[PDB]
């Protein structure tokens, strides 16, 4: 029967020879995670002085 | 493309009675398991046909069973350059004029 396996753990599916592969094995989000600023406290006391 | 790194992959599928096919799904005309699992392959010899052929009863049964491959080509791509150096006092006193 021709099954799937699992390609990735080093089992190759039915369809594939010895010189094949799978191509496309996951699926990515492009969308990436990231992290915000840091809320500051003591910079809007302070007042400005030209020079 | 630009952010697909260097390499470019294709297939190529096998035809069903070809040596390359090799795989494990052969069911001969007695229902026994072999190992070929393609009917005959690239053979022009007629008793390896006839001892090969898919017959069928008038039962009909679990025989016969054919199996597939495919192949996978690749290739990449390189980077090369070079230069030379030269001076002003090289152009300005030289005798031939156009050297550039």
Same mark, same amino acid.
């Given at each position: ?6 390609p ?12 094949s592969?799978?191509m496309q094995?996951?699926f990515?989000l492009k969308?990436?995670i990231?992290?915000a ?6 910079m809007?006391?302070a007042?400005?002085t030209n020079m | 493309?630009?952010?697909y +790194?260097?390499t470019?992959?294709v297939?190529?599928?096998?035809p069903l009675?070809d040596?390359r096919?090799i795989?494990d799904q052969?069911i001969?005309?007695s229902?026994a398991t072999?190992?070929n699992?393609?009917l ?5 010899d007629i ?8 017959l069928?009863?008038e039962?009909g049964?679990r ?8 192949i996978a ?14 001076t002003q006092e090289?152009?300005d006193?030289d005798?031939d004029? +156009?050297?550039?």
């Amino acid at each position: 029967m021709l099954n799937y396996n699992a390609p990735t753990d080093g089992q190759k599916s039915s369809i594939d020879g010895a010189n094949s592969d799978q191509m496309q094995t996951f699926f990515w989000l492009k969308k990436a995670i990231i992290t915000a600023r840091k809320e500051q406290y003591f910079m809007p006391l302070a007042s400005v002085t030209n020079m | 493309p630009k952010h697909y +790194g260097k390499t470019i992959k294709v297939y190529e599928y096998v035809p069903l009675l070809d040596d390359r096919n090799i795989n494990d799904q052969g069911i001969d005309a007695s229902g026994a398991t072999i190992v070929n699992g393609n009917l005959y392959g690239s053979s022009k010899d007629i008793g390896n046909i006839t001892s090969k052929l898919p017959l069928l009863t008038e039962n009909g049964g679990r025989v016969n069973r054919v199996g597939f491959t495919r192949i996978a080509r690749e290739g990449s791509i390189h980077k090369f350059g070079f230069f030379y150096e030269f001076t002003q006092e090289s152009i300005d006193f030289d005798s031939d004029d +156009g050297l550039m």
